[PDB]
Design a protein around this ligand. Structure first.
Ligand SMILES: Nc1cccc2c1C(=O)N([C@H]1CCC(=O)NC1=O)C2=O
Ligand SMILES: [Zn+2]
Lengths: 817, 381
């Protein structure tokens, strides 16, 4: 009873894993980039990267490592999905219709058991004797690998310790060996087990447990001829081999801890190490020792190379080209030239792949002469936040870097300027001031200002200082940078006109945060007014609480202080005044309005509806919905249906039934539509990317809602007519018997509603990607796709339904993006 | 002060009996569905799960039901009655039997049984049986547990920096304010991807809320850190909800909530916004000193105690209580505590039967500094 249609406009570009191996052929070198729902296979050359395939799986990639079993010419691929849809893929060139066949498939989840808090870990024996996993605490799942094993049967093995940090197989051993570090009240230890397949149980490790630093996080297995594992902590990089033990404590890696790595040599003489701050370390192993043919370490020196994008997963390609795969910034392709050294940096940028995510907030604006629309986003984080402009005329994306994390955005038109909040990291020096770290867009504006109101530590700690920028829509240069007081945090920002006043006021809601107290006690609402390139504080109101989100009502201002939703009236004296209150049991986070309906949500799914009766002047409570889940963003599709996202990357649609004859059913919200989008949704906003011409009879779609995601893909969820939903449902349920997906993951699985406690089949949502994929299917298969569809409902049927009519139907739905 | 009294004997209710026939606990339920269960009448008290309850039954029908239940699954339903009497209940909590004893002696019915609640449920309609023990349809309400709030947007990179070292020592200054800053800054490091700050996610976490509740509780009374406060948020929330001096409507509202985090937030709000106490008929009372309330038991400031003449009675262990009158000599023939003598302490204006002063019996005790109140005539204001 929802009949919604979700489609993907811009395919996700975040990177969460990259590996290399001879996949396509024994002679080529590939860089498989695992983004999210999509997989891309590249080929490396002298000039750079040449794309080959864009294959999309029915799940989220979580584990991707290449292995080569005996008797194989080209490397196979092992992929594990978040929904535990394990599969083994093999590349194969068939003429020019390159396809990825599936060697094996099968679910590996257990009936009962909490998922591990650290996360899914995928490890493979270097001899390709088995495949390891850690899905549930205390259950190190093992999947035997054999030519006859086409079902992936898994037998659990009990782990003696519950909290396991990192487990990775060791090299150069006759029997398979693991080396993991666990957490205990007495401290952290590294202990090894000798897994035996015949006994299906653990054994005694080659070398006994050894105490390690209290911040051991990541483990690297050194290949032959060295052996052993390197345990990298926050302060030291150690090495364990039983009898042998080397450890160093360099001060260079003291600022930030190492979270990612990738080997660079067949013998592992050198290594790569990445950290969150965004610098590329360069570990070295000294192999000059040779007593009687064996090789052992002598030094663990750490040498810094330079600063690159914020690392998420590294890889060393040929000829000293390192793919610094980012996740919250922009991907790069740096070169490790040890002879340039322009100023002390060993890295120079070569390429830059666009990475939209993580989108934080959005706005749709017609920056051209009332033509198309333009999703001005707020991408990036930490030192790589930037403004992106996404047009529709393939999507063209131009970047405006700020070197500063942006929070929200809004577009005032009567001053042709953007308003974007920001938050840069400021280090606390031992002088009472605030010294910066890098030249950010807040400190390089044409002018500047510092807020000064009188209405109310350790050397090394970081303190966040907030700013409100004003950016022109043409040059995209910063014009002014207003800075709030100390320990003030900016949360809300709305550009709207109030009351009978003719000007457009920037309004920012802020909430003071102190380390001593848990939740904010006093906040502030400030009403700016941009004019002649000078920000002025026209009005200032103080609130005993936090300003979480704000909207406008046709000349009135609405704010949600703590757990209370408040309405503010703009008087003729330019001072905000309170009008009505509605004390809620929940803390109002999201405010989305349409007409007189107010959609008050929270972070615990407690969707609540409100209606403002004008004759009485006080809020009235209409609908209720309580269910424990983490709601990410909520949007009002129409006067009845409310859309939102919740835990496990799901989408849900709630409908209010005004036709109910009993008060008990009217005061409750049904759950009509549930969908597993596969992405985490951050913000919703109305608008469309395509020219909004009247189009005579228009299209079957009606309405338009865009959403942004952490991985950075743009989708377009719309509404559908009554018969079109049934026709599309029949077509989708007939498409599943023609197309062959990679891994054999069933479509209803990749779209079934998912939660740690309950799963139910998806209803009320039509997958736009599956329907849009029909135009790529070969013509002879189209005859099998449709045979009794009963095409027309309005004025005829045409039972045969032909094949060309469906092409017209799908194209009309494809024209919307 | 600890007044040198072991606070584990008042929990076991030694006065009830000695040679208890212990029943081993193995019992669960449908896990989100429905069942049917006998209901014991003549009881009016909301039973939070994890709270112990003793029972004393005299009429033949309920003792016959007790023996039948003993030779059956050990569970009976205690409906959480609302303000309106006459079967005006919607929510109830099942009770488990872990100890039984006849002690017939003279003999009418005479049963020495103690019970603890396990699960929550709701009643559709109250079916009535002419035997005397009414049985009801019951939908076992769910116990919803939520994952970590940062598990949705967690990076695949810094998955490993999520198991922190244990707390430094225990209950010390500069080892909590300094450590909690690092905890918040490191655990919720990926909060910048979403459109919300880190402290907002801190408001909806499990460990931080439990630490705040523990700090407030130790501000109230001298609690020995992990003095039978389970690390699990579910049992901790139930125990703290049971041991608070709040009205019945707020307690049933707490019982309504099915998620641990919502329950903890609501409970924190309630005990932050509740300071005063009243004497029902009287305008006010000195019991307003909510801060000066210690717990002379392992179950908390409140527990369930029985009287030798019938209905179960409620208690509140306060250090000092004014606006009261003392009547009767200190006697200990049937004492709720082993080494204490109880004195009937009446009120000063309304003269309600609320209050019980306990006097000194030994040297290393609390000399004439102890009281036990009653929620029937006590209401927060
Ligand atoms: N309403 C009555 C009536 C008679 C006797 C007692 C009570 C009563 O409440 N307690 C308490 C007093 C407090 C105590 O220590 N143990 C008890 O059983 C009695 O002995
Ligand atoms: Zn009184």
């Amino acid at each position: 009873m929802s009949y919604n249609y979700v489609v993907t406009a811009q395919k996700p570009t975040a990177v969460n894993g990259c590996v290399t191996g001879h996949f396509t052929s024994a002679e080529d070198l590939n860089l498989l980039i695992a983004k999210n729902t999509r997989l891309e296979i590249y080929v490396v050359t002298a000039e750079g990267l040449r794309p080959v395939k864009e294959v999309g799986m029915y799940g989220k990639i979580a584990v991707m490592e290449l292995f080569r079993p005996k008797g194989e010419s080209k490397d196979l691929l092992f992929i594990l999905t978040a929904k535990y849809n394990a599969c083994i893929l093999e590349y194969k060139q068939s003429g020019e219709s390159i396809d990825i066949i599936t060697r094996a498939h099968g679910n590996v989840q257990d009936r009962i058991g909490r998922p591990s808090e650290t996360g899914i870990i995928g490890i493979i024996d270097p001899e390709c004797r088995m495949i390891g996993l850690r899905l549930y605490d205390g259950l190190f799942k093992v999947i035997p690998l054999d030519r006859d094993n086409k079902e992936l049967k898994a037998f659990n093995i009990r782990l003696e310790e519950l909290h396991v940090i990192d487990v990775k197989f060791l090299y150069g051993c006759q029997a398979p060996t693991i080396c993991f570090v666990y957490q205990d009240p007495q401290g952290r230890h590294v202990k090894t087990y000798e897994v035996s397949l015949r006994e299906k149980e653990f054994n005694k490790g080659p070398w006994k447990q050894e105490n390690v630093e209290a911040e051991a996080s990541m483990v690297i297995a050194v290949p032959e001829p060295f052996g052993g594992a390197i345990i990298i902590g926050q302060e030291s990089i150690t090495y364990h081999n039983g009898d042998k033990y080397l450890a160093i404590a360099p001060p260079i890696i003291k600022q930030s801890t190492i979270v990612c790595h990738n080997r660079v040599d067949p013998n592992g003489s050198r290594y790569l190490l990445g950290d969150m701050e965004g610098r590329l370390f360069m570990l070295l192993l000294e192999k000059e020792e040779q007593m009687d043919g064996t090789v052992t370490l002598k030094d663990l020196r750490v040498e810094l190379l330079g600063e690159t994008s914020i690392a998420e997963c590294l890889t060393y390609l040929d000829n000293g080209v390192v793919f610094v795969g980012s996740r919250l910034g922009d991907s790069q392709l740096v070169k490790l030239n040890v002879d340039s050294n322009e100023q002390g940096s060993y890295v120079v940028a070569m390429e830059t792949f666009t990475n939209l995510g993580p989108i934080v907030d959005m706005c749709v604006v017609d920056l051209e002469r009332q033509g198309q629309g333009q999703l001005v986003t707020c991408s990036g984080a930490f030192k790589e936040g930037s403004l992106r402009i996404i047009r529709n005329g393939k999507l063209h994306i131009r970047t405006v870097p700020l070197y500063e994390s942006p929070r929200k955005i809004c577009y005032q038109e009567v001053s042709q300027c953007f308003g974007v909040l920001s938050s840069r990291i400021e280090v606390q020096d031992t002088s009472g001031g605030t010294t910066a770290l890098r030249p950010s867009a807040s400190t390089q504006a044409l002018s500047s200002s510092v807020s000064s109101s009188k209405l109310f530590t350790s050397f090394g700690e970081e303190v966040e200082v907030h700013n409100l920028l004003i950016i022109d829509q043409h040059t995209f240069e910063v014009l002014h940078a207003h800075q709030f007081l100390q320990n003030e945090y900016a949360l809300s920002l709305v550009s709207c006109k109030l009351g009978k006043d003719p000007n457009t006021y920037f309004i920012v809601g802020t909430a003071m945060v102190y380390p001593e107290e848990a939740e904010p006690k006093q906040g502030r609402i400030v009403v700016f007014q941009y004019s002649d390139g000078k920000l002025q504080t026209v009005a200032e109101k103080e609130v005993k609480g936090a300003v979480y989100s704000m909207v406008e009502f046709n000349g009135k201002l609405l704010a949600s202080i703590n757990s209370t939703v408040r309405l503010y009236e703009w008087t003729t004296e330019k001072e905000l005044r309170t009008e009505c209150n509605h004390y809620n049991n929940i803390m109002a986070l999201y405010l989305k309005t349409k007409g007189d309906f107010i959609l008050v949500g929270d972070l615990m799914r407690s969707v609540l509806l409100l209606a403002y009766k004008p004759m009485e002047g006080n809020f009235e409570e209409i609908a209720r919905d309580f269910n424990p889940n983490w709601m990410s963003a909520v949007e009002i599709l129409d006067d009845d249906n409310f859309l939102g996202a919740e835990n496990a990357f799901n989408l849900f649609v709630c409908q209010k039934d005004s036709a109910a004859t009993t008060d008990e059913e009217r005061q409750h919200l049904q759950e009509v539509g549930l969908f597993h989008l596969g992405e985490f949704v951050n913000v919703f906003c109305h608008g469309s990317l395509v020219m909004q011409n009247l189009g005579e009879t228009s299209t079957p779609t009606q309405g338009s809602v865009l959403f942004g995601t952490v991985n950075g893909m743009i989708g377009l969820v719309t509404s559908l007519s009554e018969s079109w939903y049934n026709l599309l449902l029949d077509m989708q349920n007939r498409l599943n018997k023609v197309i062959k997906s990679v891994g054999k993951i069933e479509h209803s699985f990749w779209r079934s509603f998912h939660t740690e406690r309950k799963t139910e089949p998806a209803t009320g949502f039509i997958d736009g990607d599956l329907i849009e994929s029909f135009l790529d299917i070969s013509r002879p298969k189209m005859q099998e796709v449709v045979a009794n569809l009963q095409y027309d409902d309005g004025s005829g049927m045409k039972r045969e339904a032909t094949a060309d009519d469906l092409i017209k139907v799908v194209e009309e739905l494809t024209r919307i993006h | 002060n600890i007044i040198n009294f072991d606070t584990s004997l008042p929990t076991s209710h030694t006065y009830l009996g000695a040679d208890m026939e212990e029943f081993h606990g193995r019992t669960l339920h449908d896990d989100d569905s429905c069942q049917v269960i006998p209901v014991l009448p003549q009881v009016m008290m909301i039973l939070i799960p994890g709270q112990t309850l003793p029972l004393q039954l005299f009429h033949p029908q309920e003792v016959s039901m007790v023996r039948n239940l003993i030779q059956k699954d050990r569970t009976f339903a205690v409906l959480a009655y609302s303000n309106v009497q006459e079967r005006e209940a919607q929510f109830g909590t099942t009770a488990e039997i872990y100890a039984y004893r006849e002690e017939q002696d003279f003999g009418i019915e005479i049963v020495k049984v103690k019970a603890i609640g396990r699960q929550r449920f709701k009643v559709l309609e109250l079916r009535t049986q002419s035997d005397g023990i009414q049985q009801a349809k019951v939908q076992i309400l769910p116990e919803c547990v939520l994952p970590s709030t940062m598990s949705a947007v967690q990076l695949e990179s810094l998955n490993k920096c999520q198991i922190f070292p244990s707390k430094p020592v225990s209950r010390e200054d500069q080892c909590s304010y300094k450590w909690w800053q690092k905890y918040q800054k490191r655990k919720f490091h990926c909060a910048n991807l979403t459109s919300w700050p880190r402290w907002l996610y801190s408001l909806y976490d499990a460990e931080t809320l439990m630490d705040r509740i523990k700090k407030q509780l130790r501000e109230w009374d001298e609690n020995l850190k992990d003095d039978s406060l389970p690390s699990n948020p579910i049992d901790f929330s139930y125990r703290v909800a049971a041991c608070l001096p709040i009205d019945d409507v707020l307690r049933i509202q707490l019982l309504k909530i099915g998620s641990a985090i919502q329950r903890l937030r609501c409970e924190l709000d309630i005990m932050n916004k509740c300071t005063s106490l009243c004497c029902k008929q009287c305008q006010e009372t000195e019991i307003t000193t909510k801060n000066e309330i210690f717990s002379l038991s392992l179950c908390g400031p409140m527990a369930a105690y029985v009287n030798p003449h019938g209905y179960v009675h409620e208690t509140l262990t306060v250090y000092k209580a004014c606006n009261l009158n003392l009547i009767g000599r200190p006697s200990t023939e049937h004492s709720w505590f082993p080494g204490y003598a109880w004195t009937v302490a009446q009120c000063k204006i309304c003269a309600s039967h609320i209050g019980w002063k306990f006097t000194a019996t030994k040297k290393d005790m609390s000399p004439q500094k102890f009281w036990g109140l009653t929620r029937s005539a006590l209401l927060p204001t």
